[PDB]
Amino acid sequence: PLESQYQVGPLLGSGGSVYSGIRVSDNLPVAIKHVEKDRISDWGELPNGTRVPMEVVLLKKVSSGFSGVIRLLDWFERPDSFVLILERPEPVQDLFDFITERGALQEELARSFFWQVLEAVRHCHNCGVLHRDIKDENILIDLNRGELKLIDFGSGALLKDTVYTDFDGTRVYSPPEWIRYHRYHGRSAAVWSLGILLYDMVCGDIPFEHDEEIIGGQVFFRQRVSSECQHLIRWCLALRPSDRPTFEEIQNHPWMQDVLLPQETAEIHLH
């Protein structure tokens, strides 16, 4: 009984389609995401053997406990679609719109956001999940708590140590080894997309729009950015995957020290 357990509100957006909603049981704000079966790329199976979109498999693997990941609360199957019930922060703004409205972010704020994204991606990898579409569009800001949340695992995969030869994420966040050879390893590709994301935050837009820029390996800074932040970005965007930092090396980097707490981030920068 899906139409009798949630009250459906306005469209949030589409690409499937996502609606705002309220769980009738306890007025919990939710998001209601509709996925068309005819569009499902990769399929998986639950423990029960029931075949579901891989997105549902990945979301279940990361939705245990609290984290900076949007949690799946429930899901339903329909004749031609799956319906996903997700948490919904309120008030919320995605990081793309946030950067559009505010311009390049102060480094203190970019540091807090980037730190929280790294903790969220670490949690995904610990749960066996590779997101494969890290970008400002896929990050929500809980404006009152100052907490960031990863969304949209529809391009993700189970994490493995061997080479990936498929990709359906965002090309301008994809690494040069995907552009050149249609091959990448999961962790170093993630670190590349995190370098794009960090440049995006401190410069106000992504560095590369074209394949030639992605493989050229030259990072021009269009805004005043500290030498320490430039170095971290350029390290994340190393052309050779094995030259990129691990997550531990990113979080131990000097630019990453003395991060603000989420509550402080909201009070200083979002309220």
Added chain:
Amino acid sequence: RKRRRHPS
């Protein structure tokens, strides 16, 4: 210059 979203 033009900042835009990029679809997957």
